[PDB]
């Protein structure tokens, strides 16, 4: 409308800040505290607060006065007139009963910060529930406004169908050819486009909202997008029940899911349940396990990556009656997703969808997978689209968070990823998946005591092929992300003096160190990010340079736990080293 409730207190108001990126309602007290304490001096009501005299055009509430019934410049004001902005209040409708809040100072920060220091993202998650939304809107609003800052790309030459030659206009910084970046082609809108560099090279791979055939000399612009208005909270209000509501158990489970009826039932005695699942503990199993235990129920599976949502579709394909399954692909289809399920049949008993592609519907169970990789925006969008009797958050605050491409200075603790990991970390999880089915007992006991407080167990026994060395080596920055050849050279001698390890997989905290490892040892390489989901049978973690990013325990965990039988780790930090229950080697004895 244009009369609403203060986004800080709940008071009624007709005023909103006209230079904050999202124009939020502010009451007469909070608007005062906002404008005196911040560069924001433009106040909007039904009519903007500007000077009425012709051609004046000053819009600084600290300079506008009320004369008669029109607003006035200091130079233009009539004889008697009072300021719009004095006494601690801004001139609005409900001037009597605007209470205000001490939390106005948290607003002023959220409304003014550039989203670069990690201190701001922690506030965005510890604040009041209404400000949790404002932070989330403005965060996504500035992120889409930064798109127009990155440079544009022209097509120099076509190296093949379908691979291209990036050419990036200098004079403005150049965005990463990444999934987090969606370009549109061109004076005709050719479609949506996503990019990926082919084997660490100067050319780029290519998937799109197909199928236009590109002409050399085209353009790719990171198009800024529109940002929703958040109304549903990040987490719906919690309800405890005396009996399984809305859902109807079955008798009985097949032999496979019997171990999870205990937990499947819990998911029915509360409005929302939170499930932690370290790698290999089979969370996709648990998630489809619900729809088997409550076969009458409509369940909607959702997550962030099309990869995660496809991971659920697959586990569902072999356990569920594909007749009433549907994959919800948006109108703009850029990634090739699942194919065996029907498409866009918004009525089927089983729905699979990206959060962004969620349709407005309802469910008896809503399953949100990879919850750590969410943003509080993502949550509020889930609760707005899906009215649901139950919600089962499934994720792991020890694995990866969502990439926050604006954050440069700072470290975000896992307790402040979502409103949901904040719960999992302080209160603990409701369900915990404690049996690891993927890893040798050596590496699971190291994580189980590093990040899981020894709640995590092992099924595989020890493997022996778990090794450990404190080789510092020197680091060199040809590329900004670091490089350390002196310890890769150790790997070469290791692998050359070793047998099956040739089929190992290289995992380093740094995007460059992998690339050179492609030169010096030519193994299959995967970033710790590009390894969640996949599991490998021999891995080598070559950390580097003692940066924070390198000592990041969470990312450490996802890398290590890719292993099925064997692992070694050349370590650049003496402290983390002795936490690995792996057999140590030395430079003089790496036999
Ligand atoms: Zn403002
Ligand atoms: Zn207020
Ligand atoms: Zn004026």
Author numbering: 0 to 185, 192 to 596
How did the manuscript describe this experimental structure?
Nsp13 is a highly conserved protein in CoVs and nidovirales and one of the two central components of the membrane associated replication-transcription complex, which performs viral RNA synthesis. MERS-CoV helicase has an N-terminal Cys/His rich domain (CH) with three zincs, a beta-barrel domain and a C-terminal SF1 helicase core. Previous biochemical characterizations have shown that CoV nsp13 exhibits multiple enzymatic activities, which include hydrolysis of NTPs and dNTPs, unwinding of DNA and RNA duplexes with 5’-3’ directionality and the RNA 5’-triphosphatase activity. Our analyses demonstrate that while the domain organization of MERS-CoV nsp13 and EAV nsp10 is conserved, the structures of the individual domains of nsp13 are closely related to their eukaryotic equivalents in Upf1 helicase.
Intriguingly, incubation with a 5’-triphosphate-15T DNA (ppp-15T) greatly improved diffracting power of nsp13 crystals. Next, we collected a 3.0Å resolution native dataset, which we used for final structure refinement and further analysis. There are two nsp13 in the asymmetric unit (ASU) with three zinc ions bound to each N-terminal Cys/His rich domain. Unexpectedly, no additional electron density for ppp-15T DNA could be identified, indicating that a stable nsp13-DNA complex did not form. The CH domain of MERS-CoV nsp13 (residues 1–112) is a compact domain with three zinc-binding motifs stabilizing the fold. The nucleotide-binding pocket of MERS-CoV nsp13 is located between RecA1 and RecA2 domains. Sulfate, crystallization condition precipitant, was found bound to the P-loop mimicking binding of the NTP’s phosphate moiety.
